Amino acid sequence: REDAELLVTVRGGRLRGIRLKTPGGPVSAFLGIPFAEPPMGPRRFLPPEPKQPWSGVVDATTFQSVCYQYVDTLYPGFEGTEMWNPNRELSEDCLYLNVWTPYPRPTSPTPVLVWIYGGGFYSGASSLDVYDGRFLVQAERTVLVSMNYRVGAFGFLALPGSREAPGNVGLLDQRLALQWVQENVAAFGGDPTSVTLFGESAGAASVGMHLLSPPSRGLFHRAVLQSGAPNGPWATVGMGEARRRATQLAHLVGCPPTGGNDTELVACLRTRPAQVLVNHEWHVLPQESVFRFSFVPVVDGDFLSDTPEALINAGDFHGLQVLVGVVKDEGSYFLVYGAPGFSKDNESLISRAEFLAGVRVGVPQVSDLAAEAVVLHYTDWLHPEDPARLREALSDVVGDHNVVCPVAQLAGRLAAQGARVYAYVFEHRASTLSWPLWMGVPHGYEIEFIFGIPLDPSRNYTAEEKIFAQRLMRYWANFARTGDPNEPPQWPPYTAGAQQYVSLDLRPLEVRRGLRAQACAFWNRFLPKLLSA
Amino acid sequence: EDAELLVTVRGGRLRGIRLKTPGGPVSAFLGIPFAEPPMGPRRFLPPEPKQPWSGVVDATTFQSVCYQYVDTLYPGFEGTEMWNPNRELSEDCLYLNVWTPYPRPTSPTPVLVWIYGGGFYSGASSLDVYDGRFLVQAERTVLVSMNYRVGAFGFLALPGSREAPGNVGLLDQRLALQWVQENVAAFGGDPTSVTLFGESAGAASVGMHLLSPPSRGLFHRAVLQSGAPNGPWATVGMGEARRRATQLAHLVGCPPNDTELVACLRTRPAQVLVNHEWHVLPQESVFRFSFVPVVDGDFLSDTPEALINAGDFHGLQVLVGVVKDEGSYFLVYGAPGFSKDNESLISRAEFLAGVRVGVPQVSDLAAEAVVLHYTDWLHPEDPARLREALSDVVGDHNVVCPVAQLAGRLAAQGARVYAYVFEHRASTLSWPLWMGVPHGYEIEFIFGIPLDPSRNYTAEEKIFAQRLMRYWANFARTGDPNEPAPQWPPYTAGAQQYVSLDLRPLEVRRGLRAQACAFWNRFLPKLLSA
Numbered sequence A: 001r002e003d004a005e006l007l008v009t010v011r012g013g014r015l016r017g018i019r020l021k022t023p024g025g026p027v028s029a030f031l032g033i034p035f036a037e038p039p040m041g042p043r044r045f046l047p048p049e050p051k052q053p054w055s056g057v058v059d060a061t062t063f064q065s066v067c068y069q070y071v072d073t074l075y076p077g078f079e080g081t082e083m084w085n086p087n088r089e090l091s092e093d094c095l096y097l098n099v100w101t102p103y104p105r106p107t108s109p110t111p112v113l114v115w116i117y118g119g120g121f122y123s124g125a126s127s128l129d130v131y132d133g134r135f136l137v138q139a140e141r142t143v144l145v146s147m148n149y150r151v152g153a154f155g156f157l158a159l160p161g162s163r164e165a166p167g168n169v170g171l172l173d174q175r176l177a178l179q180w181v182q183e184n185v186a187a188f189g190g191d192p193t194s195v196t197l198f199g200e201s202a203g204a205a206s207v208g209m210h211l212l213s214p215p216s217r218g219l220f221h222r223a224v225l226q227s228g229a230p231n232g233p234w235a236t237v238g239m240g241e242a243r244r245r246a247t248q249l250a251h252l253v254g255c256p257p258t259g260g261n262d263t264e265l266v267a268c269l270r271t272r273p274a275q276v277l278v279n280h281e282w283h284v285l286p287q288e289s290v291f292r293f294s295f296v297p298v299v300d301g302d303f304l305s306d307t308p309e310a311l312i313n314a315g316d317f318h319g320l321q322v323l324v325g326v327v328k329d330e331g332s333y334f335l336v337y338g339a340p341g342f343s344k345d346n347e348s349l350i351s352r353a354e355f356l357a358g359v360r361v362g363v364p365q366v367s368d369l370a371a372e373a374v375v376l377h378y379t380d381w382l383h384p385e386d387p388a389r390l391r392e393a394l395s396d397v398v399g400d401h402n403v404v405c406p407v408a409q410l411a412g413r414l415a416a417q418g419a420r421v422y423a424y425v426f427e428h429r430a431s432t433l434s435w436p437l438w439m440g441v442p443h444g445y446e447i448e449f450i451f452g453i454p455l456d457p458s459r460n461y462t463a464e465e466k467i468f469a470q471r472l473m474r475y476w477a478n479f480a481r482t483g484d485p486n487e488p489p490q491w492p493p494y495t496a497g498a499q500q501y502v503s504l505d506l507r508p509l510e511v512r513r514g515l516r517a518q519a520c521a522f523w524n525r526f527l528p529k530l531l532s533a
Numbered sequence B: 001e002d003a004e005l006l007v008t009v010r011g012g013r014l015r016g017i018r019l020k021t022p023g024g025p026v027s028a029f030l031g032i033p034f035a036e037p038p039m040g041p042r043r044f045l046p047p048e049p050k051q052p053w054s055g056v057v058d059a060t061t062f063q064s065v066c067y068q069y070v071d072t073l074y075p076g077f078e079g080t081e082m083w084n085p086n087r088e089l090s091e092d093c094l095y096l097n098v099w100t101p102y103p104r105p106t107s108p109t110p111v112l113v114w115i116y117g118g119g120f121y122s123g124a125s126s127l128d129v130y131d132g133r134f135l136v137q138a139e140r141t142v143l144v145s146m147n148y149r150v151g152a153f154g155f156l157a158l159p160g161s162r163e164a165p166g167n168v169g170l171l172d173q174r175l176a177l178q179w180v181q182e183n184v185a186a187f188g189g190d191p192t193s194v195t196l197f198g199e200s201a202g203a204a205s206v207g208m209h210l211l212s213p214p215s216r217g218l219f220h221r222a223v224l225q226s227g228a229p230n231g232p233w234a235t236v237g238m239g240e241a242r243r244r245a246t247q248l249a250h251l252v253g254c255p256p257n258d259t260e261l262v263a264c265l266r267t268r269p270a271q272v273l274v275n276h277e278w279h280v281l282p283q284e285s286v287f288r289f290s291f292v293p294v295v296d297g298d299f300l301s302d303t304p305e306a307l308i309n310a311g312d313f314h315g316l317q318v319l320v321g322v323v324k325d326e327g328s329y330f331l332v333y334g335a336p337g338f339s340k341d342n343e344s345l346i347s348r349a350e351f352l353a354g355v356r357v358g359v360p361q362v363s364d365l366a367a368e369a370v371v372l373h374y375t376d377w378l379h380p381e382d383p384a385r386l387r388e389a390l391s392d393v394v395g396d397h398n399v400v401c402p403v404a405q406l407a408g409r410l411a412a413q414g415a416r417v418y419a420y421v422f423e424h425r426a427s428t429l430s431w432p433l434w435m436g437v438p439h440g441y442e443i444e445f446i447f448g449i450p451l452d453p454s455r456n457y458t459a460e461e462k463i464f465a466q467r468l469m470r471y472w473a474n475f476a477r478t479g480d481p482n483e484p485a486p487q488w489p490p491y492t493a494g495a496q497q498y499v500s501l502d503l504r505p506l507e508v509r510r511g512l513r514a515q516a517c518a519f520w521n522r523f524l525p526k527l528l529s530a
C-alpha cells in the first residue's frame, strides 16, 4: 500500500515524499513543497502570498522549477560553470522548498539547518546537485530545509515607495519559508526552537539581512555565512539607484510606451515575457564591472531600516552564535568574467596597464583618488610590473573588497557586541576541480565538502577528501546543535583583538590570526573616510 | 716664519696654522673673510664681496658663529652639546676655512666643500665634528667650509621687497663657492674639480645649488647626506614667508610698509630676534623651522620638486644616503611620551598625537592615512612597535622619502646616483640604545674623527672611518666611490640598489623603503589636491 514515514501533514494539507538511498543508509526527502502562491501574472514583483490549503495529498517527490534567471554562457559545456546553471526548467511558478529528514523520522525534536543558495541575487536554485541535503542528514541526523526564492528583476526590481514593486520580494520569499519552517518543521521531526540559517555568497548576504531585520530575527537561532556578507558593496543598493535601474530596464523593453506612474509602468512590465526581462537585465548597470549585479536587495527602510553597516554597528548581538569564513582565493573566479587579460584557458599573466584597468573594473564607481589608493596599496613597489604578482594582486583586490573584508568587519563587530563568533579559511583545492591552477581555491568550492558530496560513490573524490567532508559536516552540525563546532585540536572563537580563525584543509586544524588585517584596515577603516571627502 | 702657511688670495694676504694628525701635519687657514660683515643696514641683505685688505689677516683660529638659537633641552649632554655653538655668536660671521695637505700641493688637488646642517636655524663650520684635518691628510684633498647666516638673519623674507629679499643665507653659500673658484688654486686646489657635500639642511642647500643655474656652474659633483631640497621642511611659499616675517616683527615690538618694517627690525639686537624665532611657527611640531629658503622665482624659479621633475641631469654624479633611524632623534623634542631617558614606550593615544606633531599642517584625512599605513593591525597597541612606527613616520616623511624621490628622479633623468644607508651605531654614542643610529651620527666617521686618539673609537671603527673617507674621496675625484672587492652599484629607478655601510663588507640591497615612500611620494600629494 503506502509507507507511513513518507506521509506528513503540514498546516496547508497532506504531503507524500520519497525514501532516498544514501551510501550510509536511507533518508526521507520531501522535494518541491509549495510554500507560497505562484508569483505569476498580476503577482509578479509582488510580495509572496502564503500557500492556500489544499485537499488530497501533494506529491513532494522531486525538485520543482528553477526561478527564472539568466543562464551562464561563458564556457559552454564546461563543468566549472555548468554546475551552477539551472538543472530544472525555468518558471515563475518556483516558490517551493525541500525538507530532508532521517528515516525513520526522528522521535524527539532534531535541530534544523536551513540553506539559502547564492548566485549574486540573479541566479541559483535549491535543486543543484551540489546542494543535495541527503548526505548531511544521513551523516549527522539533522533536518535540512532549503527553499527557492525569486532572483533578478523578479525578485529584486524595486520602484521604492510603490506597492506594485516594493522591492526585496526575493528576501520575503525566504522569510515566508522561514515562517513555514517554524509552523511545520516539527511535523518532520525538527526542532523549531533550534534553527540554523546557512548560505553562501548572496545566500550568506541574505542570512545577514535576516539577522538585521527584526521580523526575520525571531525565526532562527544561529547563522553561518560562507563567502558573503550583507555589508558587501554588491549586496544592496540605494532607493534612487534601484529606481533608476528599474526605470531603465522598463525603458529597454518598450514599457511605458518614462517613469510616469508607478502602477502604470509596472503593469506594462507584467505583460512582458520573463525571458525578455532576463535578456535586458545586465544592460541597466551603470558601468563595466565584475562583481556587480543589477537587482539586489534595496535599502528602503522596511526590510532594512538602515544600511547593513549601520545596523551591524548599532546592533546588540548577545545570545547569537555565528560561523563565518572564506575560501582562500575569493577573487580569482570573477576575473575571467571581464577583467582584461584574464581567461581560464591560460595563465592570465597581466601587464601593469591591464592591472590598472582591472582595478577600475573590480572597484567600480569610485573616484580616481580612491582607485589610486587601491593601486598604491596593492602594488609591490620593488616589483611593480611583475605579471604573476599583478595577477595575484588584482585577485586580492576584488576578493578583499567584495568578500573577505566585508565579512571580517561583520565578524569583528558581532564579536565586540555580544555574539560568539567562529571563523575559518577554507584552503583545500578539490582533486576534481576543473578550473585552472592559478585560481587556487576559487569562490564557492567549499560547498560540496560541507554538503558531503564526496560521499557520492559515483564521484572520484579521494578517500581523504571523504574523511575531510565528514569532518566539516560534523563542524557544521555541531555548530547547529550547540553553537560551538568543537566536540564535547580546538577551534577558538573569533574576537576583535586576537582575530583567531582556523584553516580547513586535509591537515588538522591550525589557528592563525587576522583575516587579512592589513588589507581590511584599508577597506573597512580608511577608504570610507576618503569617499566622504 | 713658515712659507707654507702664507697665502695671498685676491683680497690680500693670509697667515695660517700647522695642525697635527696621527698621519702627519696639515695646513689650515681658518676664519678667512669672504664677505663684508652683514651688520647694521646690511642685515637681511645679500652678501657683499669682502673688500681687499692691507697687512696679513690672522687665519689661525675659527671665527664667530652666526647668530642662532642654542639648544637647552639636555644641558651638558654631549649628544646635544656637540651641535651647539662653540665660539661666540656674532652677526660678523661670514668667514670660511681651508684645510690642505702639508706642504701645500703643487699639482691641482680636488676640492671638497662642506655645508653644515642645523635646520637653517643653527650650525657652524667650527664644530669639532666638522674638523677637516683627517680627510685632508688621509685622502689628500682640499677641504673648504663656510659659515652662512641662519635663522631670520639668513632667511627672513618679505618677497618683492629690496629690504628683505630672502634666501640670503643661500647667497652666502654661493659667494663662498665663487670665492673658491677665484682663490682655491692659491692653496693647491683645483677649481675645476669641486664636490659639494652637506648634511641635513646642508644637503638641502646642496640640492638647491643644483637646481639654481647661477649656482650650478660653480661645482661639479654633489653629496647629500640625510637631506634633500624637496623635503617638506626645506622651503616655504611667498605668502607664508611674509606671514612669518610679519609675525616676527610684531613679537619684537615692530609695527607689522615693507621698508619701515625691516628698518624697525634692524634696530633690534640680534639676540632678540633669535628669542622669538620659534614662536612664529603655525603649529606645535617637530621638524619644522620658521625661516627656511623661500620659493620666490629668483634663486629657485619654481618649487624644488618641480625643477627635479623637469631637469636634465646627464653629466651629474650624486652620492646620497640616510642613517638607519632618521626619525628617532627628533621625537624627544615634542612627541608626547618620548625622552632619551625613558624607553619611550608610548601608548596608541600618544602615537596618534605624535602623528599630528611629526606630520604638521595636514588635513585629518591625511593623518588617518598615515595612521593606516604605519599601524600593524595585528598589534595595534604594542608600545615598542608604536615607538618604532612613529620614528618611521618622522624619518620617512622628512628625510628618507624626499631623498628617495630625488635619487629616483635624478637617476631616471641622466644622473649617475649612488645610494647608501648608514647602519653603524658608534661605540661612543651617548643617545639611548632605542634610538638606533640617529640623525647626524655618520658625519664623525666621514670626517675621520675616529682616528683622533684623544677619543675611544675601536680599532675597527678607525678602519671603518678610513673606508668611508676613501669612498667619499673616490667620488670627489672620479664620480665613482668604487676603488679604480665588493662593488657599489649605481642606484636606478627600477633596481633601486643601495649599499649598507657598517663594519661588514658592502651589502647590496633594494628599495629605500619603497613601500613607505610610495605613500609619501605618490599617493599623499594627490590626497592634498582633492
Ligand SMILES: *[C@@H]1O[C@H](CO[C@@H]2O[C@@H](C)[C@@H](O)[C@@H](O)[C@@H]2O)[C@@H](O[C@@H]2O[C@H](CO)[C@@H](O)[C@H](O)[C@H]2NC(C)=O)[C@H](O)[C@H]1NC(C)=O
Binding pocket: A261, A262, A263, A264
Ligand atoms: C496612477 O495610475 C493608477 C492607475 O490608474 C488606472 O490605470 C491607468 C492605466 C489609467 O487608465 C487610470 O485612469 C486608471 O484609473 C491610479 O490608480 C487608480 O486611481 C484611481 C483614483 O483613486 C482609483 O479609483 C483606482 O482604483 C486606482 N487603481 C489602482 C490603484 O489599481 C493612481 O491614482 C495613479 N497615481 C497617481 C496619480 O499618483
Ligand SMILES: *[C@@H]1O[C@H](CO[C@@H]2O[C@@H](C)[C@@H](O)[C@@H](O)[C@@H]2O)[C@@H](O[C@@H]2O[C@H](CO)[C@@H](O)[C@H](O)[C@H]2NC(C)=O)[C@H](O)[C@H]1NC(C)=O
Binding pocket: A338, A339, A340, A341, A342, A343, A345, A346, A347, A348
Ligand atoms: C590569455 O587569455 C586572454 C583571454 O583571451 C581568450 O582566451 C585565449 C585562450 C584566446 O583564445 C583568446 O583568443 C581569447 O580571447 C587574452 O586576452 C585577450 O587577448 C586578445 C588578443 O590576443 C584580445 O582580442 C581579447 O579581447 C583579450 N581578452 C580579454 C578578456 O582581455 C590574453 O592575451 C591571453 N594571454 C596569452 C595568450 O598570452
Ligand SMILES: *[C@@H]1O[C@H](CO)[C@@H](O)[C@H](O)[C@H]1NC(C)=O
Binding pocket: A458, A459, A460
Ligand atoms: C570518475 O570515474 C570515472 C570512471 O571512469 C571517470 O571516467 C570520470 O572521470 C569520473 N566519473 C564521474 C561521474 O565524474
Ligand SMILES: *[C@@H]1O[C@H](CO)[C@@H](O)[C@H](O)[C@H]1NC(C)=O
Binding pocket: B257, B258, B259, B260
Ligand atoms: C614707507 O616708508 C617709506 C620710506 O621712507 C616712505 O617713503 C613711505 O611714505 C612709506 N609708505 C607708504 C607711502 O605707503
Ligand SMILES: *[C@@H]1O[C@H](CO)[C@@H](O)[C@H](O)[C@H]1NC(C)=O
Binding pocket: B454, B455, B456
Ligand atoms: C673615553 O674617551 C673619553 C673622551 O670622549 C674620556 O672622557 C674617557 O675617560 C675615555 N674612557 C674611559 C673609560 O675613561
